[PDB]
Structure 1
Amino acid sequence: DKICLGHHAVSNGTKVNTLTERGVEVVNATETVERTNVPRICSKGKRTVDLGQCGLLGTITGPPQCDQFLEFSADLIIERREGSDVCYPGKFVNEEALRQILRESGGIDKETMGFTYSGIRTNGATSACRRSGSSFYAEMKWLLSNTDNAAFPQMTKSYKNTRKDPALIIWGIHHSGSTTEQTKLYGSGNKLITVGSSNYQQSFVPSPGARPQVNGQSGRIDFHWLMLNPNDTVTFSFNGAFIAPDRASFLRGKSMGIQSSVQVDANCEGDCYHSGGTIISNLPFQNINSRAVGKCPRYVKQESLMLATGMKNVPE
């Protein structure tokens, strides 16, 4: 006598929002915002370097904690809160720029600057940098006057980059904890260091004085850097208080750098990382960490945005 048309329905629908209404109940729906974090750095298949105690900028200068990271190779570089760039206290000028360069480097290759010295000492060492006895930054040389109080000679040292890629060149200016210490190490007088390339132009005069003790030392070293272009030359004209580079650094290729507080895991894979771990998801959005890096779902403020995958639910 009659045939009637209809559609399915369920007792327990799922609420979604539309242009016209909040909390419309539909037969089924699915989440578009990722909330689940994996509390590990998911590193399966990636050449990974976990710096631990070594500060990223220490890979260039070489305090004792960075001895095993002087020429690393990596797809993924992990900095840790406990990492330190220094042994004898000090810091890099333009430090974060240099960190950003090294994070993307793919690692570093090192080559000798070819500097030889006469008329001065080359073996400055300190109890702040220990390798079973007093020592110093593995990639640098603390140049001193031949004997106590002696005049450091006016020196010039040159290095040409004969490779096809830019060379990362570092040096340091030593600020003793006192003027008397400055004289004892490098002789009296107002010291000077100039550094120039075809691209670069900058000078340095030391300023000794008492800083509060760090790693048992009241002196400081100002570290500085420049990228030396292929077949360009850097000249160092100095007359004391100069921490000379022993080796130049070259970038190997490409990598990504992260900062994290969680363990590496080679059993999971992911490309979106933050300090608390890895966001593994195919969803378009995430509400886990606005500073996640790599290849990530877009960060949004909402905890949940349900996408309807069914018709409106109309139970009897």
Structure 2
Amino acid sequence: DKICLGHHAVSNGTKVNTLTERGVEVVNATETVERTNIPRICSKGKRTVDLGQCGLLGTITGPPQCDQFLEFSADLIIERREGSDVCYPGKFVNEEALRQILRESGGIDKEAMGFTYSGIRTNGATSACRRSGSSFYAEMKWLLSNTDNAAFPQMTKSYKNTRKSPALIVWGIHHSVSTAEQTKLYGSGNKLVTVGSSNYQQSFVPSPGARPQVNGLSGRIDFHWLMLNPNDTVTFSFNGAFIAPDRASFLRGKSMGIQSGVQVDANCEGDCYHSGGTIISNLPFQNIDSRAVGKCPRYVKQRSLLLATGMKNVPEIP
């Protein structure tokens, strides 16, 4: 009579690694590194905007592309590669910092700054910002002299942020193709635009000169921005070449922004994103994208790390 103690085993053994062995077979193992990607932006439960052709910075200045998003609200903001912050050629100064701010803003609330002008044109428009006909940035005013080559009067406009949150303020400096064109618009003489706050001080001069044609135009409007503290004031002293703001921006709350090239899905629910889609996983690691954002498993170099979920597999003696 005999009794034997034993343990189970399989012919279906899977190899894992240990401190000592490499490729030791165990009965059962599971994967710890996620590679399974969902090629969509899972937006269920999250208020989502797909800016598309509207650049994120364009939501503040307001080219035609961003007219739908001038006061948008969101939990999840999606940037698209075709997006543009610009109609009339130019670029923001400190653009990326500003993007990072707007990505977690939860959207923007606009407020009129209440500037009034005299002895001056404000209907500055261009063929590049076509909205029905030739137009301009929706939140901005392109100031001219009055007739042509006429003198542009020195002005001083101020604005106080009477709210409890910081105010996003944006103005533009216009760079003409020539001093001839600059004179034709704002009159002769050197042009200066000074911007004063109570924790900010800067100065701006136009740089007229020939540049490659973008959208058929050689002129450039480069935007600048600051955050105005509550009860603090901004002052704009200028005499031409100035792109004045009409409204200020206020951040709504909290959000998250991503860059993607894949469609949206309001049925799938996710919390970790990358440009190629959404990562939904209980696994601690992933090998899809190092730049994934949101709440994500850690990125690793290895495509696979098997965790033994069973004992060492020792085949039966036949």
TM range (shorter): over 0.9
Report the CA distance between 1:196 and its aligned residue.
Answer: 1.1
SS in 1 for 2:183: helix
Over the residues paired in the alignment, what is the CA RMSD in angstroms?
0.5
Deviations 1:115-149 (A, max 9, x none): 11111111100000001110000000001101111
TM-score by length of structure 2 reads 0.99
Gaps of 5+ in 2: none
Structure 1 residue ranges, 4+ long, deviating more than 6 angstroms after superposition? none
CA distance in 2, matches of 1:272, 1:238: 47
CA deviation map 1:63-86 (0-9, x unaligned): 001110100000000000000110
**CA separation in 2, counterparts of 1:196 and 1:257?**
31
After TM superposition, give the deviation of residue 208 of structure 1 in Å. 0.3
CA deviation vs aligned residue, 1:192-250 (integer Å, no higher than 9, x gap): 00001101010001110111110111010110000000000000000100000000000
Partner of 1:76: 76
For 1:26 and 1:272, the matched residues in 2 are separated by 32
SS in structure 1 opposite 2:91?
A: strand
Paired residues for 1:1-316 under 5 Å: 1-316=1-316
Alpha-carbon distance in 2 for matches of 1:251, 1:23: 55
1:256, distance to aligned residue in structure 2 (A): 0.2
User: Deviation of residue 165 (structure 1)?
Assistant: 0.2
Measured after TM superposition, the shift of residue 60 of structure 1 is 0.4
Deviation at 1:13, TM superposition (A): 1.1
Q: How far has the Cα of 1:91 moved from its partner?
A: 0.6
What is the rounded CA distance, in whole Å, between the counterparts of 1:27 and 1:259 in structure 2?
Answer: 42
Residue 22 of structure 2 aligns to a residue whose secondary structure is: coil
Deviation at 1:47, TM superposition (A): 0.2
**Alpha-carbon distance in 1 for matches of 2:267, 2:15:** 36
Distance 1:35 1:68 in 2: 37
Q: Distance in 1 between matches of 2:247 and 2:235?
A: 15
Once the two structures are aligned, what percentage of the paired residues are identical? 96
In structure 2, the residue corresponding to 1:92 is in which secondary structure? coil
Query: Which runs of no fewer than 5 residues in structure 1 stay unpaired?
Result: none
Q: Kindly provide the CA deviation profile for residues 18-53 of structure 1, in whole angstroms up to 9, marking residues without a partner as x.
A: 011001100100000001000000111100000000
C-alpha displacement of 1:267: 1.4
Count residues in correspondence. 316
* TM-score, length-scaled by structure 1: 0.99
**Cα distance, 1:3 vs. partner?**
1.0
